[PDB]
Every structure is written in structure tokens, then in C-alpha cells.
Design a protein around this ligand. Sequence first.
Ligand SMILES: Nc1ncnc2c1ncn2[C@@H]1O[C@H](COP(=O)(O)OP(=O)(O)OP(O)(O)=S)[C@@H](O)[C@H]1O
Ligand SMILES: Nc1ncnc2c1ncn2[C@@H]1O[C@H](COP(=O)(O)OP(=O)(O)OP(O)(O)=S)[C@@H](O)[C@H]1O
Ligand SMILES: Nc1ncnc2c1ncn2[C@@H]1O[C@H](COP(=O)(O)OP(=O)(O)OP(O)(O)=S)[C@@H](O)[C@H]1O
Lengths: 525, 525, 525
Amino acid sequence: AAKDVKFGNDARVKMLRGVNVLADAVKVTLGPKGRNVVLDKSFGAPTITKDGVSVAREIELEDKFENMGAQMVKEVASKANDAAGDGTTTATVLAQAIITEGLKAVAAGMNPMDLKRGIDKAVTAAVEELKALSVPCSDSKAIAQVGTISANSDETVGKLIAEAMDKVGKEGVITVEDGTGLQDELDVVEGMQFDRGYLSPYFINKPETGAVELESPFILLADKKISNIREMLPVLEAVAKAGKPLLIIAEDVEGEALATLVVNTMRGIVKVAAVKAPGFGDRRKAMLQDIATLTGGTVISEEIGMELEKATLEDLGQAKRVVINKDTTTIIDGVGEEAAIQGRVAQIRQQIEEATSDYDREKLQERVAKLAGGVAVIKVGAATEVEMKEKKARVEDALHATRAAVEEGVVAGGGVALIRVASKLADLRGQNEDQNVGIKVALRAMEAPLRQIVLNCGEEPSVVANTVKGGDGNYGYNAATEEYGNMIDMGILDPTKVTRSALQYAASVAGLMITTECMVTDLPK
Amino acid sequence: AAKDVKFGNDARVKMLRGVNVLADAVKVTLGPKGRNVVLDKSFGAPTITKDGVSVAREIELEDKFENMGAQMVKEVASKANDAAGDGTTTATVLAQAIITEGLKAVAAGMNPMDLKRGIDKAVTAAVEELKALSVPCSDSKAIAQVGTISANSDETVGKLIAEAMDKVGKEGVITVEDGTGLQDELDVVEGMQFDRGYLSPYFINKPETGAVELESPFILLADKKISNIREMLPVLEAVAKAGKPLLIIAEDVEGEALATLVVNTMRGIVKVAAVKAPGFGDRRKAMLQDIATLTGGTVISEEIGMELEKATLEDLGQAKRVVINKDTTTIIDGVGEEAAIQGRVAQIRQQIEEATSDYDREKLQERVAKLAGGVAVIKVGAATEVEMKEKKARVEDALHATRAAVEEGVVAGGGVALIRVASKLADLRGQNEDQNVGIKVALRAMEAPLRQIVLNCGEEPSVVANTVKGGDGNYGYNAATEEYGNMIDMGILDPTKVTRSALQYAASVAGLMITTECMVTDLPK
Amino acid sequence: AAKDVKFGNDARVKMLRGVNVLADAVKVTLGPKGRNVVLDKSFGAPTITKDGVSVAREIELEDKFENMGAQMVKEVASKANDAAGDGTTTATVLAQAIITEGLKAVAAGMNPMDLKRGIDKAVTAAVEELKALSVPCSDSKAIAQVGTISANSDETVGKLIAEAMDKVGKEGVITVEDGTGLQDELDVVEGMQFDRGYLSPYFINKPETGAVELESPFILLADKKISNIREMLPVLEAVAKAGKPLLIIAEDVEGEALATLVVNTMRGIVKVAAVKAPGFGDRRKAMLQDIATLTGGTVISEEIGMELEKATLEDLGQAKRVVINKDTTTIIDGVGEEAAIQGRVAQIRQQIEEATSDYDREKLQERVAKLAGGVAVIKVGAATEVEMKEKKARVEDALHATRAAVEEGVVAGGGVALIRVASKLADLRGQNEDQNVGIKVALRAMEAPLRQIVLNCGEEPSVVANTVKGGDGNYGYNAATEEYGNMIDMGILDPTKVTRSALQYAASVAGLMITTECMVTDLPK
Ligand SMILES: Nc1ncnc2c1ncn2[C@@H]1O[C@H](COP(=O)(O)OP(=O)(O)OP(O)(O)=S)[C@@H](O)[C@H]1O
Ligand SMILES: Nc1ncnc2c1ncn2[C@@H]1O[C@H](COP(=O)(O)OP(=O)(O)OP(O)(O)=S)[C@@H](O)[C@H]1O
Ligand SMILES: Nc1ncnc2c1ncn2[C@@H]1O[C@H](COP(=O)(O)OP(=O)(O)OP(O)(O)=S)[C@@H](O)[C@H]1O
């Protein structure tokens, strides 16, 4: 239809208003002293939440221009949340700071492209500087410490994460569900993890988590493009007779199949989920064979000649559980015999031995790693179900933070990492005045998180920020106790990966917003 | 859709207006001299009630922000009602007082978080002070007295509840039914009680009471989740042939099952209500076996291999009547033979003997307690049906108040307990000026119930409050007779539990509301 | 009446709008290719002028705040005009450029005071750079050249002014009148020069010239502060009998005295003007005695004991013509006998000889200089009266430009002096980022005059400015012939005192207006 076009400074001020609204709403909740934000619910009492993700998710604006500016900032912040699993409001605060200052400079007649270049130079220098500040978190002691800190200062969860990491390995797989007993337990069983997301969001049976949980499902294996609904009617009838949930592994699923599966799930007769095939090409076929070995299933490929119509329940694979993250999968305790798994591992090991290509050898090495290490499973232990769910959530987020710290490292949190790298990069200069201004904008915007935390605490942000800058090393402000001190000693730690991702994504969105003039949208109707 | 966002002081004033409206509407009906409140009935004459619960339930405003604030206060007040049984209007009055004073202080630039900390410290000291002031109510004489006072000064109900408590036990199960003869009767038979709530409010066949009553129903004992309606279609055919209502106890039911059961109940062909299974894991199965032994039913579990499709009426359990409270269940006189009942009791007794874990032994002990003590049945006795209903309601609310007093204790009522606690804590001080102001706000808000009661009586609230404060012990104001005196001599008594719950929940909602800035809601349309 | 107060950024934008309006209106007429501007005349046809002063004088805006901004810029531009004589539009263009860029920077969040400091540092460096670039104009050849260039390329007036200044002296005083014959005439006669302005503008009998012309007037000479009108009634009667205009030398006059003189001049019976006494103190008395010697008058002083009431026509002095200026005064051919003039000159010469104080000796030296050099009179010569007026105006403005060039020097005009200065000062840096920005604002605003001239010519200003910057020395753009070349060779020359004053005053107003927060006015009524 017709579309209103606003280009020039008016577009920029609309975008600025939108990012301002979203950033205020979401930054009010940053830190331990984050002030509550109450979101209206359609039916029943409103929810109260200091979680930045929820308040950001529930933000849409009336007028299209500032609404889409807010949507851009929200999308990049959610991307940052997906990258590291944390640091959403930090990313949005860094965004709001950089966009505000950069758009002020652009209104000041500066060249937007040079500002973009200066901000990019500043942020890459800050990223490598943070990598210089990073403290390794390889020892199990720091693993337990960060697990404790992430989960509201609980030592048991940190201990559990430490033991799981010791058992399954540094880069293994860790999952958590509920346990029957009051005591936490640990076990390791052959499993899986390949990075593929669900085809449609509607497969989520528990929206609050964002994944699915199929207790004892079948699993299908297919190297063939899902073309017609007629191909999987026999398996649908079989699974309906079985009264048991089902999963689908396919090369790709067509939109008509998307509509059919969504309709079937809404009907509730069959609980079917589908996910993209992992890997690619002959590697994809080999790992599909690995999954068939795991679950006792069989790969149905057109080249072989078999068809999805000729599929019996015996041909289908099985597992005792499966969870699909938004961009990852995990099957646990494949029914397939362990002797066959060992044989397949040995076969791929000789494939590694004969391998000459470096990247193919890396693919084979990670294939044997994921096929032999399996998955470590955690079961939470307490008395009542409310504490089951809350402690399960604590374990989940602590595991996310701990793995993020293991991947890259851990730096003194509380927003002092950014302060320290900013003070380090005080002498950075670009190729002209505009690039220098952009660099200074980035540097002064990287002080935003600490200032916001202090403002939420109620103290004067400028005084605390100046005091923190005066100190050196990890000297910083404690929001909880309102006392200065070595941030690492008091346990306030934030994974280097989360801060790096938040900073980089905020810089990316801010640079992309600074260099925008035209903005086409539907008419207000 | 688009969402209007209001953050800052305007959010606070909107929420203050909403709580003011709800608090006025519900506090006008506090105490014995509560003024009547009139509400719409869509068809017919309006209803008239001094009951705070109804007037609070029917309040929800037109503009979104104050509406949602009123919804917060209403939700917390209803939570207090569910926890204790009464004290809803007291909770809302305390919440209004604390909100008004706290927001007035926050407008004065005081730190919201410190105010919340001060209020929390004050209310914790207040709660332990109430526990200090608590008077035990273990004697049957005070049990009868509180039962009499709760039920509009009726001694017969106090006598009945005293006899029932003596017969079954202190922490037994008490139930009230309708009797044939004018004389009141009492009989105790093997029964059940586990704390689980209904899946959907639509199961409620009697909305005014909040539960359901099934005369001589079947009960379907299950162990797995409900995946398809096909699993219990033969059960539905059997219960339709029987023409007698049915209940479902199972691990869980899903959304399509809820829709199916709601549609079936609206049809009226089958009267079916489902409830979540009790316990957790192995003890869940143990108490399911206990239910099987009570009702003569059989546990259906996929692990055993049994399926819901092959369900026969003989396999179904039975009872002579069933009532499911909003968050509790009771089955009375399970048809199952009593012999197996004491066999199971003895078995679990030896399980207690061999038990080494303390909490598992506690679960086994409460299991044998609930399996041996059974349920008390107290059928009301009078001439006509109108007095049947009103006296049944009186027995219900008197039972709630009496058990609440038994659990914790009983303190001087009329709002004097809070006055005495506030006077005791007059010297409490926090860590700075803001926490001190918060503590003083809580303390001066503790005088709201007595002041409101006196204002409803039409006297001068400040004069009566000052006179009560001048006195010591339990010296207070008898609203009914408009004369001072020892509040316990004339029997005006409040359970410690209800006052404690009201105070704590008012403090909690006040802490959440004081520290709120952002408020997102749909546009006014 | 009440007063509307506007402080903050809205004040800056209001002032910016006002100065933008004034600057556009007045800058359209800059340079030789200045576009015509049409003003409005209350009665008759509109006037048409390319003169910047005329268009600026007639601009005041309906909105009060814009009007205050415009009036500030107009005041400082008129002050710049008064300092040198020509360069009003250049001053306004510089002021507009600096104001626009500086207020844009202030909106960019930079410190106004540091911006003002940077601009002041830049303009001081620019002023000393102009003094470096200055070329002496002592030779009569360049004097005739600049006289020709100022007077629309007329060589005769350049010749005349050269001869006159050779006759009198470098720092002499030059005057122009109308001659009976078509041939130009020149003569030197004993005269006077002291710097004092008219007490009220209403004394101006010729508003288009801003001065008074009294043919053969009497001159009063008084050292006493005017007190009452009765003191000069007898002299007023005497001069009314004489039927001749009068001029008054007095220590000072008050409100009622000047009001009565204004009333009398409006009546037209007596055409009397009054000017403040020159200098100060015993020097004032000594050169009042010099004036008495010049005109044959007498000093009337209370200390001597003589009063203004006792004043005969013989006591009054005489001259053959007198002209007042806004801040200057000259009397020509005092009737006083030349022998007395020589005697007084000798007396003050011996006073110089005995003088020991350096500054008193300087006053004595300039006193003898003005008492011996006298005045120059240049009678313009042509046929008709219209060319009489236009050539007299040409002589006046050429004389102003030539004396301005003689005082300080002459630099390559056409706006390239400032271009070269800005290019020279490209490496100047302040004490921080804000001062650096202010310096760059001043430097980029120095290019405004040439850009505006080129834009008036219709060419692309950026291209011509870049070409001129590329060249070095006095290479520049000729607006009239639209071809590049050497300014000195092409005769486009500007006094170094006309450009310095414009630049300094533009910088002064820009600094004074950048650091303006609050701005009160009267209500719009
Ligand atoms: N008590 C504390 N005092 C100071 N800084 C803290 C404290 N607790 C956490 N942080 C820091 O807060 C940053 C993360 O922001 P928070 O909102 O507090 O936590 P979060 O779980 O990351 O929430 P978001 O919305 O994802 S940023 C990290 O740099 C932590 O080191
Ligand atoms: N005769 C009395 N004199 C003084 N106070 C009384 C008297 N009778 C009851 N009260 C008090 O009045 C309050 C009763 O409040 P209600 O009007 O029943 O509402 P509520 O108990 O706060 O909550 P609900 O859900 O409405 S019962 C309690 O604090 C009693 O202690
Ligand atoms: N032929 C020319 N080529 C280029 N520039 C010229 C030429 N003739 C004059 N100029 C410049 O044009 C400007 C003359 O400006 P004007 O229009 O006279 O206003 P102004 O001199 O700034 O002030 P006033 O009071 O109006 S005279 C000076 O900067 C001259 O150096």
C-alpha cells in the first residue's frame, strides 16, 4: 500500500525518540538494584519483572518511525542475548549512549561515515584490549565461583556445574531437568548436540522457556526434501496409534508442510517437531548416519531409493528425551546399541587417520568428540516444585554464564571492564576530526553501564564513575553493598564474552543507525 | 500491538489513584460497623454486601495504568485471603496506607530502594513481635470461643468444631455437609487430603463457593501425562452409560485436554473435573497407591504397561462424595475395603521404621497420619434450607478462622495487635535517614486498620487510636458496643496467622510498587 | 508590564533565527555584484539600495526574541562601521557564520565558555596575522589608487585626496564642500579637530548625512555645567536677532536643557546645536582657550566668575562654517586673528619644551599639531547639482577608506585576506577539544565573505574558495571581471583596519552571544 517516506534529520529524531523510550524502559532494570518494571497482562494481574529481556520484548510504539527504531535496537539486543546468553540491558544501554551521542554529533554537522569509522576503530581497539584484560577461568575453582555468582550466590549449583564440566570435558554438553529426589545427582549418557533451530516458533510447547521437551519420542531421519503431506501420513498414523511424541530430521521442510504441522500441533493429536538437518553434504549424511546409530533409526534418502511412505515404527529411531533450543538441538540416551556407537566412533577415527584436508579432519575430530563424549545430565534436588522450577532456572542461567566464561574468559564486572579499557584507550586517534569525535563518543559511551548501575543504586553516577576511573586495576564500585573494593575479590564477575558481544553489537547498531537518512513505512491507519 | 509507556512520577501517581479507588471501595466495609456496598447485577436487582472480597473482586477501572495498579493490590489481597482465610480488607487497608506514605516520601526525593529496605526491616521485626504477642489456642475452650466469634456469635458451631477437633486431631481434616434432621451430628470416616488445585476455573459448578461437589463419583487413577483424548474416550462412554460424575487424578493434562474437558462440561453430558497429582516421583506413586487402596482403584502407568484405553468401570475407584477446594482435594469414604486400608497403613509404618532420611521419614509420617486419621464430617442441622445455607457458610468460615488460630495462635483483635506492635517497635532505626523514614512509614501504616474501623463506627479515629495507644496490654476499642475494654474479655480475637499474612503481603506489594518506574500497557482503544 | 523569560536552548534558537533573518537581508548586498534590496517608504515609491547600512538600519522583527538577536548583531555591525567606515556587511557575514557554527556546536553539547575562549584565541592570532600581511600605504601612488578604487574608479578624487594629504600631513584632517566652479579647488585654512559627538540625534538637520551644517555661525564657549534655561535666554535672543544658527561648547548639558534645545530647533526660530566639551581638566581649559583664540570667543567659567547671562555678541566667537559628526567635530576658519593663533602656538610650544611628563607632552604636541596644521577643504567641481551630491559622497567615502588604509595599512581585498590568514593559522590548537572546535569554527567562518561574494556573482562558492585557497600570496577571484588574478595588480584593495575591525567585532558579538543562557523580554502585546 501507500508508504510515508521521512528522510533527513526528522527521520533521525524519530529514531532517537524510539531508542530513548526502549532504552529507558529496559535500562531501569539494570544491575542488582534494578528497579522493578510492571508489564500489563491482558487477563489477570500485571507481571512484575526486573528481567530486561521481558520488558524489551513487550515494547512496541504507536507511531511507526520511532517504533521501528526501537525494534532495531530490540532486535540487535536480542541478538546479543543469543550470542552470549546474557548482557541484554548492558547492550541496550551502550546502544542508547552511542546513538544519542552520535546523532547529536551528526546534527552538529559532522560526517556520519567518518563517525561510523571512528566508532568502529574505537570498538575493535576496545575489544582487543578487553581480550588483554581477560582472566582465564579454566580452573574448577573459578568455575564454581562464577556458577555461584550467576545463580544468586548458591554454592551447590556452582559445585554441580564444576563436576559436570570435569566429567564431560571443557567443551562438552550439559543439560538440566528436574529430579525425583531431594539430592542432586550427576550421570553421563550418550547424546548429541548440533546447532540447528526450530523451523517455526509455534513448535514451542513451553513459551516461557523457548524450547520443547519430548519425553521418550520417536525421531525421524530423512535426507530428502519434504515435498508433499502424503509422504508422512503413514508415520503420522503410526505415531497417533502409539500416543507418543515425535521428532523430524529433514534436509528442509516446505512452507506447506509448515502449515500442516502447525495445524496438527494446534489440533494436539500429534506432538510433532521438525528441525533443519545438521552439517552439509556428505558430512551431513555421515552425521545423519551417526544419529541413526545413536537412536537405532535409519536414514531415508531418495538416492538410496527408500521413501518416507515406506516407514515402519521399527525403522524410526528413539531417545529418552530431546530439547530444541532456538538454535540448537540435543537428544539424550539414544536407544541404539552402544556397541554400534563404539564401532561408528572407531570408523570415524580411522577416517580421521586417513584424513589429509585440515578442515575435513577438524569436522571428523569434532564428530568423534560429540559422538564419544555424549551429554552430561543434571537433576535438581529439593522438596517442593516451586523451588524445583526456580533452582532449575538458576542452574540454566548459571550454566550459560559459566560456559560463556570458559569460552573466552572473565573480567571484573560491574561495568568497570569497560571503564578500564576506555581509560586505556584515551590516546586513540583517527584520521581526522570527525573520526576523533566518533572515537571519543564510543569511549564516553562505554562508561554508560556503570553510570546506570550507580543511578539505579541512587548514588550520584558522576562521583562514583570518577572515583572508579581514578582507581586502577579491578578497583570498582559494589552496587549490592555500596562499598568500593577489588571487584574480583568480592566475586562480582562478568564473562568477557558477554561484555564483548554486547559492546560489539551496540557499536554495530549505532553505526548502522548513524548513517541512515530515508525511512519508508506504511501510512498511519 | 502498540503499547503506551509511562515511566517516572506519572506512573506512580496513576498507580496511587488506582490503589486509592480500590482501597476506598473495599475499606468502607471493614469491621463490624462496615457500611454496605452495592454492586451491579447484569440481570435483576443489584447485590448488597459488606464482604470485602466481593467488592474487591468486582473492581477494575477504565484507564489502564490505575486499573493495573488496582489489579496488583487486588491480587496480593486475594493471595492473603488464600493464605489465611480472612483479613482481605485489613491487607488492602495496610497496603493503601503504606503505598500512600511511601509514594509521598518518594516524591520527596528519598531513595526508593532504601525505603523498601526500611519497610522490610520494620515488617520483619513486626512479624517476630506478633509471634511474641501470640497466645496459644490449644485449649478446646478458646477453640469454641473463636468458633463462636467467627460465626456471628453462635455457640453451637463452636461446640461442634471443638468436638470434631478433639475427635480427629489438631491438624486433622474437617469438612461440613448438609444434614437431614434438625439435630447436629458428627461422624468420622476414612478419607484423604492433598494440596492441589483445579486445572481450570470452568470446572466450578458452584461459583459462589469456589469448588465442586460430586455425589458418589468415579475417580480415574493415572500416573502419566494426558496426550490424547482417545486415551479416555472409552472412559467417557462408560461414565456416560453410568450417568454419574467422574474425577481425574493424573500427573498432568495438556491444553487440548483442558479444552476438551471444558467443552464436555459445558455440554453437560459428562461432569468431569481434573486435578494435578500430589507428591513427586516415587512418593507421588506411593500416595497414588494409597488412593488406589482408599477408592479401590488401580494405578495406571505406562512404565507398568497399563494404558488408559483399556479402562473398565471395575478398575475405577469410587467415593461417596468429593470436594476439591481451589488449592486442595478431599475424598470421603473411599469405597475400597477397609482391610487393605490398615494393611497399607501398617506397610507405610514399617517403611517409617526402616526410614533413615529425615524428610522422607516426615513424608511417610504425614502419609500414615492422613491415611489413618481420615476426615471429619459435620452435617449442619436446622429446620429450613435458607438457614441450612447460611449456617453451612458460618461453619465454613468459623472452621477457617479456628484452624488458622490453631496453626499459629491468637492475638487481641480489632486492629489493636498492630497498634501494640507498632508502639513496641517505636525505637527501631535503620542504617540511614531513608531507611528510618521507611520504618516510620510502616509503623504509622500499622495503625490504619483500627483507625478505619473507628471511622466506620463514626467516631473520631485519631482520638480512639490515641486512647488505645495510651493503654497497654490488650486494652482496645470494642467497635460493636462502642466502649473500651480488654479486647480478649469480650472475645474479639484475631488469629495471629491472618494478621501476620495480611501485614506481610501488604509490605511485599508496597515494596514492589514503591520501586516501580515503567508501566507498559496497550493503547486506550 | 510583565516580562516573558526564555532561557536555555530555545533562547539560542530564537536568537539564531533573528540573526539569520538580518544576516540574509544584509548579506545579499555584499560585493560588487551585490543584488538590489528594496525597502519600504511610508509615502511614495520604495527606495532601492545595495548599501548594507541602509538595509540593516530598517530591519526589526515582529517576534521579540528574534528582534533582540537581530538588534545585537546590528549594533555590533554599526559599531564596526563607526570604527573604520566600510565593512558592515563583512562584519555581519562573519558574525552570522560564527554564530551559526558556534550555536550548532553548543547544541552538540560542547562547553560554551571554552568555545568562546577558542574563538578569541583564533581571532587574536588572526589579527596579528593581518598585521603581518599588511602592506604600508604611505606612498602617494597607492593613496591615489585606493582613493580611485573606493570612489567607483574615479582617478580625479584620488588625485585630489593625495594632494590634500600631502599639503596638510599624514595624520591631518580632511574636509569636503561644494565649489562654484566646475574645476576642483583645494585650500588649507586654520581650523580645529576634537572628538565629541552630538548630545541628541535630533540636532541633525540632514538625516541622510548624519551631521549638521552651520554656515557662518556664532560659537559659544563655556566651561560650566548647564543648570537652567535662563542662563542662555539672552544669547538666544541675540542670535534670534542675528537670524543665524548657533553652536554651544559646554562642559555638559542635562535632560531639561537638551529637551528645550530640541523644542527650540523643532520650532525653527533658533537652529541651535550643542556638543560636549573635549578632553578633560586643565587640558580641556587650555584647548578651550585655544578655541577662544581660534574664533575670537571667550571662555565663560564660574571659577573666573563670569556668567552665561552676561554674554554679548562680541564675546561670542565665529567661524565661516562648522560640521558636527556622530563622534567628531571640526570648525573651519575661526575669525580669530592669525597673529593670536601663532602666539598661542608658540606658547604651547614652550609648554612642550618645559614639559617633563610624557603623556602631558603628548597632549601638548597634538594640541600644537591641530593648532598649526589646520584643516583641508576640497571643493568638488562639476556641472550639475546631482553630480555635485554624488561626487561629494564619493569623495567622503573614498576619504574614509584612504585614511583607514593610511592608519594601519592595506591587504589584498576581495575576502582573500581572511582566506590567507585562515590557511596560515590552520595548525593553531587550544587547550582541549572544545577550544579546538571553537578555533576551527572561527577559521571556517573566516571564509564566509569570499563565499558570499562568489555566491552573489552566481558562481559555485565552494569551487572558487577552493581555488583561492590553493593559490598563495594575493591570488584570488575578481568578482567584477569573474577571473582570477593578483588582487594588488587588479586594484581590489581593502584597508587592513576595515577588515580587522569587522573580524574583531564579529568575534566579540559571537562570543557574547554563544555564552548567553537567559533572555528576558516584554510580553507580546
Ligand atoms: N552486585 C553487583 N554489583 C555490581 N555489578 C554487578 C553486581 N551483580 C552483577 N553485576 C554486573 O552486572 C552486569 C550484568 O548486568 P545485570 O543486569 O546486573 O545482570 P544480568 O543478568 O546480565 O542482566 P542483563 O539484563 O542481561 S545486563 C555484569 O557486568 C555484572 O558483573
Ligand atoms: N466487635 C468488634 N470490635 C472491634 N473489632 C472487631 C469486632 N469484630 C470484629 N472486629 C475486627 O474487624 C476485622 C474484621 O474485618 P472484616 O470486615 O471481616 O474483613 P477482614 O476480616 O479484614 O477480611 P474478610 O475477607 O472480609 S473476613 C478484624 O480485624 C476483627 O478483629
Ligand atoms: N572587484 C572586486 N572583486 C572582488 N571583491 C571586491 C571587488 N570590489 C570590492 N570587493 C570587495 O567587496 C567588499 C565590499 O563590500 P560592500 O558591499 O561595500 O559592503 P562593505 O564594504 O562590507 O561595508 P559597507 O558599509 O556596505 S561599504 C569588500 O570586501 C571588497 O574588498
